[model samples]
Target chain A: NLKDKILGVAKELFIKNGYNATTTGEIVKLSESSKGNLYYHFKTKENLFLEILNIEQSKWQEQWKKEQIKAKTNREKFYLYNELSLTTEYYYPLQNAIIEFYTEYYKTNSINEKMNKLENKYIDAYHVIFKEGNLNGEWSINDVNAVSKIAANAVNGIVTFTHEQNINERIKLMNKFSQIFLNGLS
Target chain B: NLKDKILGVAKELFIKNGYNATTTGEIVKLSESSKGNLYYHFKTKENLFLEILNIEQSKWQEQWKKEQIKAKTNREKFYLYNELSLTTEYYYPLQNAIIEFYTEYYKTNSINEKMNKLENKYIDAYHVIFKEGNLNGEWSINDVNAVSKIAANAVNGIVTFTHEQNINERIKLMNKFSQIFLNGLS
Candidate 1:
């Protein structure tokens, strides 16, 4: 409970004040937890942030899992995935802090690996749809792995470059990408 | 001549030490200039970097212009553009410093405007081919602006996510994207 409380306060502080500005002292003060207890649970501020990201990743995966289960077809699953990914407010509040952390500490193996794991989830999910479509004779992509990676990269690029685009615009743009990619597969 | 000398040394030092590590003091020392002299030439390290980037951008555009002249057709121009982008070692050495500078100062309008200008070059160049091919009846794409943005974003994403990939491999990957986008254009 103490660990969870500290994590919650830290996440809120990080969202409001950002990564560099949100001090561990403030986290301890807000969470009303002693430094000893916080360190006992998190070891360091970096460790605490890492734990928060881990929790966020789990939440993200669980959301996707629920969406996938509810989808009637792979096509529907793909659209839902695109919509949910951009629309998911879970990441919206923590966006600035996350970007700052990523830019500053990208050299760290642990941070890089966390990023890789999350990125791979997109590629991996994409490959499943590609494989399923190919097997069902809906489309024929010779290199499932390569195409999956390309689609994932396209999504990554759109998210990065199209920050000026609103949520609805991005969702529409992403769906258009799906259509283009699907046509390419066929 | 004084400004040029400072610019030359700053570029070399920035390439060698990186954005944060390279100091204004060392820059002045290396260039045999005083603080007042350096300040008269370039207001700050940030201003110095902005000047260097402006120089690099000119070099990049000039090289592209030369390659365009040498191209046999719009198709040829497109391939050459893709190849030169990844192979251009001019940006390679100073890549870390450029990225760091951009990341840290992205909030500044001057830096962000510079980035926007550079990025628009890619989209603008791609649009030339798309519009060329459309008018030439090579393809039947309805949306040039959207597609150009998508292709540019795909290139940006590929460069970001596939850092583990070697240069040759990335070139091949980028060409594959060209092919995919071309097919979609039709």
Candidate 2:
């Protein structure tokens, strides 16, 4: 219960204040726990923050799947994914912490274990989209995997591009990116 | 000056050890300065780390300018800018710190005032590239500023993509991105 409490306080603090301003001491004090207890539960503040992010990022997978079903075309599926990503996860209040720690995600445990799985999972989803597109005459993609990566990375560029804007503004910008993205296909 | 000594040690320590592993006590001990002395010079270890990033990031501008002169076209300058960024700054040893701290750069000072000026300055450079592109018939970009921001941030995504690769591998990855980048024009 105390571990949950500590994590809860941390999740809230990081969103409220941000990754830069929050301190473990503040977490310990706010959670009504001691310093050693916080360290015992999580080795470091960074670990606590990373765990929170891991859980939060994982939380969006459900919505991504649900939204995909609403799309009429495979390309729409990608846009749906982008919209949910920008709205439900990336563009909300936690954008500051999400943007900051997303970099750290690459550096941890090499992300080779879970991260490799997570990355392939998304690329797999995009692989299907590209595959279906080619089959449906959407664009006739040559290499599903390479196009998948560019698709993923292009959305990433759009995320970084819209990190500071509102939900409405964010969607419009992603659409600009979406236009460049889809239109580029032969 | 003790400040210079401390900064030098901090710089080397961060490079060798990385942002996550390095600490203020380590910085203090390694710099042969007391805790009070270290804090007296820099308000916190974060401030010290950020200052080092600020200095290191600023270090590449001169090379970017020179590299720009060597390029035959404005587009080549953009590629040159991408190469220098990937090689000299983003892909090198300090990438972990650079990647992680870069997000923080926006959260600090609203990046307004100082950051506003810095952002506009880079956007200003890209502005010229887009302007030249349209003038020389490379691409008739409708809005230079919008295209400039996309150009700036497209490279940002490429940096994230190549964070783990070697110099050779990194260059190849960027070229893929650069192809996608330049070819996206009209």
Candidate 3:
């Protein structure tokens, strides 16, 4: 319970102040947990942060799965992918922090691996839908894998620079791209 | 002369060791200049690296311009854009270093501004080609700006995580996406 509480507070602090700015003492202070109790559950600040990232990844995956059920076609699912990402307030900060974390400490192999797997999930999801459609002659493409990656990257790039525009405008742009990508796929 | 020497040495070292690991002392030694001389030319290591990035960006633009002359149509140019990025050897390390520098300091307004402008060039270039083509009914797209940004982001994403695949395979994928994007644009 204390560990979960610490993690919850740490996530909020990380989102508010960024990963590099937040400290373990601050987490302890904000969470109202003793250093011993925090250490009892987590070995270090890095460990705590890594666990938080895992939690964040799982939450996103859950959201995506739920969204997938509502869409009938891969095209709608693809659009929902961008819609969910643009509308999700929690996604941007965490992903930015993850990039910062990976860049700053390039030796975090395990953490980097986890991040890759999550990224692969989307690419793989896109690939399967595209492959299935292509097999049935729904659309044509040179390579499903490349198309999947391109789609993933397009959303990623928009997410990386979302600060350049208001949320509503960004969402509108993302929606347009999604339609274009789906159209391109078909 | 001194500035050029420093820039040259810094570029090599930054590429070899990375932006963060290479220090002012090393730059001074490698460039055969005193610390004072180094500071006289560049205010800080960050400034030196920023200049290096500018040079790198120009070099890329020149390459793109040369390639542009050979491309007769917007569709060909669009595909060439991704092809150039995939085949370019110099772009990757420099981009990684730029990301490293920006992340580590997080307060270099001038440096960030320069990077943003260079990035804007790609989006603007894409917008112009797409808009010009669409005017003549060569393609159909509601928003040129969104499409430009998405195109840039797609290749960028591939480039960012390309170590996951072989060079040959990655290039193949990039070329495929370029075609898909061009197809989508039309």
Candidate 4:
């Protein structure tokens, strides 16, 4: 119960202040627990962060799998993929932590391994829809791999770029990318 | 002279170790100066970092203007833009600082400002070419602004994506974007 309390407080702080900005002292203070109590469940701050991230990542994975089954058609799957990408429905805060970790402490192989798993898992998940579309002859596209790469990358770009833009502007840009991608898809 | 030497050393270390990783002691040691001398020049490490970044940014602007005259035509300009985007010929240690600043801080204004400057100053700098090309019956189709934005954003996407990729891979991805932009324009 105490460990859960610490994690809950830490997660809230991380969401608000970001991982780099959030301090371990703040987590202990907010959780109404001593530093020793917090460290007992989690040996170090990084380990504590990883434990929280692990739970969030698993939840995301479960949701993604469930959502994939909800789409019957390839186009629907593609649409679902984009929708999930644009929203927090698919990309959990822990995933954001993973990305940040990759950008920073790349020396950590454990971080790299998890990052690759999540990345390839998402990509391969999308590839299923592409391959299905191709097999059905309904897709009729060239270079499925390249198209998949661009589509996936564009979704990321638009989401990250959208954060900087106004709501209307972000939607407009998102619409722009969707139009370019969906309209041009073979 | 002391200030300049400190800045020069700081720029290289900032680029290599990044803003957070590089330390004030390391900076003074690398510059072969006393802590008091550095503190005299800069009140704090953050102040020193900011000053070095300013110096780097200004130098880039000055050098960029001088380098602009080399391109003979708009097509040449387009090619030159791509070259600079793919290579570090125009980028230096200070440029990395601004990029890191955007990534770590100033999240909202960073992308728009950086992307817009690249689009307006470099990519769309060929509006004259588009105009002349149109007026002289060189380009039957006009809409250089739209085309340039599209091309610019694609290259922008590639440049950012290539952070995880190698030079050859980045160039190839960039080339694909260039090819796609031209193909789509006509």
* lDDT (CA) per prediction: 0.72, 0.68, 0.72, 0.59
Ranked by lDDT, the better of candidates 2 and 3 is 3
Candidate 4 docking band: incorrect
Top candidate on lDDT is 1
The i-RMS of every model, in angstroms, reads: 3.3, 3.3, 2.9, 3.8
DockQ of 2: 0.26
How would the candidate models be sorted by TM-score, starting from the highest? Answer: 1, 3, 2, 4
Tell me, by TM-score, which candidate is best.
Answer: 1
Q: What's the CA error at residue A35 for candidate 3, in Å? A: 12
Candidate 3 per-residue C-alpha lDDT over A30-145 given as tens digits, one digit per residue, 9 for 90 to 100: 78877687666687777787778767767776778876888877667777877787776545557656655665556555655655665676577677767876776667766677
**Better by DockQ, candidate 2 or 1:** 1
Chain B TM, every candidate: 0.85, 0.72, 0.82, 0.58
Per-model TM-score on C-alpha atoms: 0.77, 0.72, 0.74, 0.64
Clashing pairs in 1: none
1 or 2, which is superior by TM-score? Answer: 1
| TM-score attained by chain A of model 3 | 0.82
Cα lDDT of model 4 by residue, B1-186, tens digit: 877889888888888877777888998998998899999998777668666655554665566556657866555555566656657633454444444444455434533464444335544445654665567553443556644444455455455444554567666655554444333333
TM-score of 2: 0.72
- Tens-place lDDT per residue, model 3, B59-159, is 87777878788888887787777777767743466655666676555445666676677678767768877887787677887777778877777666666
Q: Which whole-number lDDT from 0 to 100 does residue A12 have in model 2? A: 86
